[PDB]
Design an enzyme around this catalytic site. Structure first.
Site, short mmCIF file in Angstrom:
data_model
loop_
_atom_site.label_atom_id
_atom_site.label_comp_id
_atom_site.label_asym_id
_atom_site.label_seq_id
_atom_site.Cartn_x
_atom_site.Cartn_y
_atom_site.Cartn_z
N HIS A 101 9.81 -25.12 73.50
CA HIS A 101 8.54 -25.29 73.34
C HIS A 101 8.22 -25.88 74.10
O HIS A 101 7.25 -26.49 74.19
CB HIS A 101 7.69 -26.68 71.87
CG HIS A 101 8.78 -25.84 70.61
ND1 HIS A 101 7.61 -24.91 69.59
CD2 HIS A 101 9.80 -26.61 69.76
CE1 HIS A 101 8.23 -24.98 68.19
NE2 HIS A 101 9.49 -25.41 68.27
N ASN A 174 6.18 -25.30 61.92
CA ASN A 174 5.83 -23.91 62.78
C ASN A 174 5.05 -22.28 62.19
O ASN A 174 4.72 -23.41 61.41
CB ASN A 174 7.21 -23.41 62.84
CG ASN A 174 8.29 -24.55 63.93
OD1 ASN A 174 8.31 -24.49 65.28
ND2 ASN A 174 9.58 -24.27 64.12
N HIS A 365 4.37 -36.47 67.62
CA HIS A 365 6.10 -36.29 67.23
C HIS A 365 6.18 -36.53 65.19
O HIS A 365 4.85 -37.11 64.82
CB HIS A 365 6.45 -37.91 67.77
CG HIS A 365 8.00 -38.54 66.88
ND1 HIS A 365 8.67 -37.58 67.34
CD2 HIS A 365 7.88 -39.41 66.01
CE1 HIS A 365 9.89 -38.58 66.68
NE2 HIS A 365 9.41 -39.49 65.91
N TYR A 388 12.38 -37.63 68.38
CA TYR A 388 10.90 -37.27 69.30
C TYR A 388 10.25 -38.23 69.92
O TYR A 388 9.68 -38.64 71.91
CB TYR A 388 9.27 -36.62 68.45
CG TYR A 388 10.13 -34.99 68.03
CD1 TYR A 388 8.89 -34.29 68.35
CD2 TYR A 388 10.86 -35.82 67.02
CE1 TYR A 388 9.45 -32.89 67.32
CE2 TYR A 388 11.08 -33.97 66.52
CZ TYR A 388 9.93 -32.98 67.06
OH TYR A 388 9.92 -31.93 66.02
C1 HEM Z 1 12.28 -27.63 61.13
C2 HEM Z 1 12.01 -26.79 61.98
C3 HEM Z 1 11.21 -27.68 63.66
C4 HEM Z 1 10.04 -27.39 63.86
C5 HEM Z 1 9.19 -26.90 62.95
C6 HEM Z 1 9.46 -28.18 65.21
C7 HEM Z 1 8.21 -28.48 65.31
C8 HEM Z 1 8.28 -28.44 67.18
C9 HEM Z 1 7.30 -28.85 68.03
C10 HEM Z 1 5.98 -27.54 66.90
C11 HEM Z 1 7.19 -28.81 68.92
C12 HEM Z 1 6.22 -28.66 70.06
C13 HEM Z 1 5.29 -30.01 69.67
C14 HEM Z 1 4.19 -29.29 71.24
O1 HEM Z 1 3.34 -29.06 71.08
O2 HEM Z 1 4.39 -30.50 71.81
C15 HEM Z 1 8.89 -29.63 68.70
C16 HEM Z 1 9.08 -30.19 70.50
C17 HEM Z 1 10.67 -31.18 69.33
N1 HEM Z 1 11.38 -30.85 68.76
FE1 HEM Z 1 10.97 -30.46 66.94
N2 HEM Z 1 11.23 -28.89 65.33
C18 HEM Z 1 11.93 -28.83 64.91
C19 HEM Z 1 13.26 -29.31 64.68
C20 HEM Z 1 13.84 -29.86 65.74
C21 HEM Z 1 14.46 -31.04 65.14
C22 HEM Z 1 15.94 -30.86 63.71
C23 HEM Z 1 14.59 -31.53 66.88
C24 HEM Z 1 15.91 -32.48 66.85
C25 HEM Z 1 17.25 -32.72 66.23
C26 HEM Z 1 14.15 -31.09 67.62
C27 HEM Z 1 13.11 -32.32 69.15
C28 HEM Z 1 12.30 -31.59 69.52
C29 HEM Z 1 12.24 -32.53 71.15
C30 HEM Z 1 12.86 -32.99 71.36
C31 HEM Z 1 10.79 -31.32 71.46
C32 HEM Z 1 10.51 -31.52 72.97
C33 HEM Z 1 9.72 -32.83 72.50
C34 HEM Z 1 8.61 -33.04 73.76
O3 HEM Z 1 9.17 -32.97 74.58
O4 HEM Z 1 7.23 -34.31 73.84
N3 HEM Z 1 13.05 -29.88 66.67
N4 HEM Z 1 8.79 -29.35 67.83
#
Ligand code: HEM
Ligand code: HDD
Lengths: 726, 726
Positions: A101, A174, A365, A388
């Site tokens: 993202h 999402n 987060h 997060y």
């Molecule tokens: C359920 C499906 C998922 C959705 C809807 C989801 C949603 C998101 C969203 C919307 C962001 C962007 C937030 C922003 O605007 O900065 C994000 C960032 C992130 N997500 Fe999740 N995610 C999901 C699955 C995952 C899973 C399972 C993991 C870990 C195993 C994950 C790890 C991260 C990481 C590392 C970031 C970057 C955050 C940052 O750097 O501040 N994503 N995700």
């Protein structure tokens, strides 16, 4: 002074339609738009007007055009601290982008609930219809880098930071109601498979490559969100015109301690709308910033993005009552089985001041919950809670990312945590531990309770052995993709077919394409056959005999899964291109603009050059863009007024403008002699549903065009467009 | 075992044309291509086949599909170290992108001089024609992030790291022979003005916005490099078909201590070639990785990028003999006045194994010079020497970035520097300081000398007061832009006008467009009038009477400044689209493919779907891509063989394929009944230059089409294209 004497460098601090003024930082465009979070940022907002240019140490600079040298053609001297501070700052501007993202666009706004929800949750932000909670929202794509394009085919992120009185709650969702995978352990595998391939770092912003479809063909749990991504859900028209979903089942906890399972929804009050692929892919070339621009300009115009928060609620005793597991994030809960209850409204009404400081550094987060909410054992959600907090240590430089101004709570926060890189808070507490007597144990723990209580986890019973094992209840992969397929209109099904066909044609290894089509035969043979035919693959007899998967608790379709099957169109905020000529009939233009204005639809005046043209009555019309500079991709409909049509009738760009709009199913309206353009796009003299035509542009003409626009695209034209060369 | 039994998952380890095989890591595609640097990387290359999956601590993993939980539907446990290692590593994958030139594509290769240059430089790598120096080259754009598109309008970077026996020399240049600004102190201002604007971070990869043209309108020194970026130089066809320049005057120092001023050049052996704007812009949507891909696949095909290094040499006594200051990086030295002397050849012949490890982490810096070379007082060069060591401290995490494998010297390096983050080398010296007695003062300084000596700076005389002052000799802004303009062909001039016109039409504040047009009137009245007419601006009588700037040392033009004025065409490595039908004349296809193969021109067989088609004689023809999947933007020419033309004659995509290729000035060849497509592009019966047509693909048909391909585009078609709706 470098400004023009007429003051035209500076945008009016009033709402204006897109293109009318240069865009500007939020606090300058809309100084009177406030909320408790926006106000709290005043401590770090820095002006500029009337101030001397200085170093970061406050020393005024006399010459910011030259390095210090020994003679004017001589070498640069090491003692030039002004040069080196400025270049050092520049050299360290960049921070790591988000792992996923990375590409995202954000705005400030506020939320309030429609009624108190204290019977089902003790969450303070939902307790009082007149208590407003500021929000900050970031919308995003998933796969591409921070400099990738907006209108790619991808899932979109929709993350909301609620600055509540009892803490920050981040709802990190999402635009589809499921995810691709079941267990967080697989997230690096999936993400690496969708991301650019590691040898050459190609392709950007695209799942259309071998490693992604290799993973899909080997992990059928992915098929549900893949169907979503290949539909027109994968290419929204605007962040204002998509749905949001928290995906996981969470818990609500009320003051009596009762837990209810909940899934979260955002309903776009502007209605659901997507592009078509050819349009989306060309728009990533013509305007890779199109969603970012559209959001910013809707907010400057007063067309504020509004969404309704909604909850699907399931009582604890009904946890096992569906034919899918509630904790499986690859399964959706059909609204036919569990309705979305309306909860509140969120309005996005101010742009940030500085994209890096507020958007780039914002940290969302899903682990940031408050009392009245809790988690469930969904194995994808469970691993997200680790990721997060961890990723912000490198992305934002350390453990003090909550002191970065956009991330700070507006409620009190006090604890015994100390130090860390770029620590801002100066703690005066004589104690940095508890229990302590030396500060009489402050800050103190708070027992849980109905309001303003400490957080306690719901005491869910846990019984099993320590295992790395997927629940057997998670091992069903085809029924939800099939429900989704069967819920789409025929044209939406065609676009799904075309989505899979286009993507798998870019997979170089043919066996991967074959394995994907074999998965599709486990969902629906009509879908599998239609994709196979585009790929030149013939289904085997065995594949033709695969038993379709079971209906989902008796449902053969759920129309809430379709973008378009139930009309929800809203024209306010949309934009029409008006193709000018050098002697525009000003009566047409009066009628056109009056009708557009009454429905809050914007206009962009286009011509073959920039500058002005003068209409038949002397009215001077400034030109927003040329026909090539602002392609039809960027508007919702095209109107061509009468006038000197001879001026533009042989212009290749003006004809192409109509041919592209026609191909992309947009409404086209042609007044008076502009009807000669019918020859360019075929159209019987008798006319065609989707092309408005009349001797002049009037009440009736504008009504028909506006009604077309409320239906978004002219789906009936689909069979006419294969033949058109555009 | 998930690989297909036939082994089709794995690319053949032999050179193969673009699209024939999946692409692969360099060392797997071309294991026998070696050089000293590639060999020295063997200690860190990691394989995979036949090894067990492990954690980073070497512990074999049993179940890489699941987190450890309490019960198979229970919560995830904190004791799952395998999940947390895997997600922690993913969570911290990203590092900050380069502040500028973040988007880039790199390859390994080698350099060899044609003869010893001992008379003019004691540099070891230029000392012996039999001395081979490995190189690593990264080509880039300048403004966009690492996820931005390749075929933007921009300057391009061309950075070469020469791994010499006397140290790393990095020649960090661009594809134009001047820069936008004169003094490094202005670099952050200029870069901030071209980069996305700070409130909303728009636009990506484009200088077509207000703040860029605001800065240009206020800083006339920028006009020369702006002329080059608005020309078709700003949109190269490939990294292989652009020039390279080190821009600054540097010094060569020989063993007798004589200094000679030098500017560095790279001449592309493939010739100079650019896209046209419409094609470039659309290609950023249809394939934002087009240049990265094209570079990778050329190398996989054995079409190695080759460049010739050349020097412009100026004796120390001639420093002041030109109308412009040699130290001013906004001035070029015309090849009519000082010819480029050929020095050696560089061939890029192997792709990296891992893009992040080798490309993203490579660090080039123009301060990295070797004995035999030295700097000048150019005030832009002088500030660069500060920036490239500083910026790696954050980008690459500390002062040990030279130990990152790609950046390592292949020659010995020993000194008294210790520690720092990520320190790899374990120093065994008892001493970490000099002078020391406890290690007999090793490692020891080395006096300067003719071969293998220590670095000493040339003892240039400095005389002046400490000042922040621009040399008066730099205060001339318009003559070089005019020389550039006058040197271009008339179709090149038209493209320059259209460049400025398109870019300025995106500037929202009209007064800025006016101020730029005023600057253009100081360069050339024809140019200023033609841009003005496109923007709806009328020049004033004052502007019409501005007297032109003087010639440059008597030159009214210099043809080496044009891309096309002197033909230098090379077809090898180019690609043709072949538009199939369902019963192709196999005789035509035999003639076409073999003639292309004989000249090293690639083909891509396209159709309305994937899979196969069968020729008239039963030959089975594999389809590479669909007409929409591999648009005409991605090829150099289009051939439509005879057969069942009615099969595609009504296909919108096939017709539009030709209309796009036609508008973009590409050669088109139609055999037999394919000539029915002449009506689509409105070609007359008696035909026209740039369209090859015959009854069959035999006799001179392919020779004619290849002659067109050698001239790159059909410039004579430009008047004919304004009217086509494409
Ligand atoms: C359920 C499906 C998922 C959705 C809807 C989801 C949603 C998101 C969203 C919307 C962001 C962007 C937030 C922003 O605007 O900065 C994000 C960032 C992130 N997500 Fe999740 N995610 C999901 C699955 C995952 C899973 C399972 C993991 C870990 C195993 C994950 C790890 C991260 C990481 C590392 C970031 C970057 C955050 C940052 O750097 O501040 N994503 N995700
Ligand atoms: C005072 C600052 C400054 C100035 C005046 C310049 N640069 Fe620069 N350039 C940088 C500061 C910088 C940098 C910040 O240090 C970069 C970014 C990250 C890096 O490693 O170097 C960079 C990167 C960079 C790259 C990318 C290298 C790579 O692929 O990693 C190229 C090709 C150039 N530059 C070329 C030039 C040329 C031809 C210049 C003018 C003649 C120029 N730069 C002026």
């Amino acid at each position: 002074s470098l400004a023009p004497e007429d003051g035209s460098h500076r945008p009016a601090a009033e709402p204006t339609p897109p293109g009318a003024q240069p865009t500007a930082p939020g606090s300058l465009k809309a100084p009177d738009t406030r909320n408790e979070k926006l106000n709290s940022l005043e401590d770090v907002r820095k002006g500029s007007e009337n101030y001397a240019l200085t170093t970061n140490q406050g020393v005024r600079i006399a010459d910011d055009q030259n390095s210090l040298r020994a003679g004017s053609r001589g070498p640069t001297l090491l003692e030039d601290f002004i040069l080196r501070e400025k270049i050092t700052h520049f050299d360290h501007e960049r921070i790591p982008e988000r792992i996923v993202h990375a590409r995202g666009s954000a705005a400030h706004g506020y939320f309030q609930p429609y009624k108190s929800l204290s019977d089902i949750t003790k969450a303070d932000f939902l307790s009082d219809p007149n208590k407003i909670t500021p929000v900050f929202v970031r919308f995003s794509t998933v796969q591409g880098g921070a400099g990738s394009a907006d209108t790619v085919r991808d899932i979109r992120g929709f993350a909301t930071k609620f600055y509540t009185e009892e803490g920050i709650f981040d709802l990190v969702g999402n635009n589809t109601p499921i995810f691709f995978i079941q267990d967080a352990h697989k997230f690096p595998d999936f993400v690496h498979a969708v991301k650019p391939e590691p040898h050459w770092a190609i392709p950007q912003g695209q799942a259309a490559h071998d490693t992604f479809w290799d993973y899909v063909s080997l992990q059928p749990e992915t098929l549900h969100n893949v169907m979503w991504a290949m539909s027109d859900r994968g290419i929204p028209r605007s962040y204002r015109t998509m749905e949001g979903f928290g995906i996981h089942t969470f818990r609500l906890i009320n003051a009596e301690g009762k837990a209810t399972f909940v899934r979260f929804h955002w309903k776009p009050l502007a209605g659901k709308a997507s592009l078509v692929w050819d349009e989306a892919q060309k728009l990533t070339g013509r305007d890779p910033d199109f969603h970012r621009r559209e959001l910013w300009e809707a907010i400057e115009a007063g067309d504020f993005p509004e969404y309704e928060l909604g909850f699907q609620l399931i009582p604890e005793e009904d946890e096992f009552k569906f034919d899918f597991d509630l904790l499986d994030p690859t399964k959706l809960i059909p609204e036919e089985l569990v309705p979305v209850q309306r909860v509140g409204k969120m309005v996005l009404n101010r742009n940030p001041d500085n994209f890096f400081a507020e958007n780039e550094q914002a940290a969302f987060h899903p682990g940031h919950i408050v009392p009245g909410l809790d988690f469930t054992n969904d194995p994808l959600l469970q691993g997200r809670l680790f990721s997060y907090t961890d990723t912000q240590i490198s992305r934002l430089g350390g453990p003090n990312f909550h002191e970065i101004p956009i991330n700070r709570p507006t409620c009190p926060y006090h604890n015994f945590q100390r130090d860390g890189m770029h620590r801002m808070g100066i703690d005066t507490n004589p104690a940095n531990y508890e229990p302590n007597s030396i500060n009489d144990n402050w800050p103190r723990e708070t027992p849980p309770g109905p309001k303003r209580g400490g957080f306690e986890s719901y005491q869910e019973r846990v019984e099993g052995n320590k295992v790395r094992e997927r629940s057997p209840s998670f091992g069903e992969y085809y029924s939800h993709p099939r429900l989704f397929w069967l819920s789409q209109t025929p044209f939406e099904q065609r676009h799904i077919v075309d989505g899979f066909s286009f993507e798998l044609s870019k997979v170089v290894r043919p066996y991967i394409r074959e394995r994907v089509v074999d998965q599709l035969a486990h969902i629906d043979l009509t879908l599998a056959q239609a994709v196979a035919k585009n790929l030149g693959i013939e289904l085997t007899d065995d594949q033709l005999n695969i038993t379709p998967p079971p209906d989902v608790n008796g449902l053969k379709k759920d129309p809430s899964l379709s973008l378009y099957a139930i009309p929800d169109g809203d024209v306010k905020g949309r934009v029409v291109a008006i193709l000018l000529n050098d002697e525009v009939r000003s009566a047409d233009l009066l009628a056109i603009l009056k009708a557009l204005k009454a429905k809050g639809v914007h206009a962009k005046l286009l011509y073959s050059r920039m500058g002005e043209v003068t209409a038949d009555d002397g009215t001077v019309l400034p030109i927003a863009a040329t026909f090539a500079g602002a392609p039809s991709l960027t508007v919702d409909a095209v109107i061509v007024p009468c006038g000197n049509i001879a001026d533009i009738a042989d212009n290749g760009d003006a004809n192409y403008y109509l041919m592209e709009a026609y191909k992309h199913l947009k409404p086209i309206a042609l007044a008076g002699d502009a009807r000669k353009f019918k020859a360019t796009i075929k159209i019987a003299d008798q006319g065609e549903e989707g092309i408005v035509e009349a001797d002049s542009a009037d009440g009736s003409f504008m009504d028909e065009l506006l009604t077309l626009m409320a239906a978004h695209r002219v789906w009936s034209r689909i069979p006419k467009i294969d033949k058109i060369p555009a």
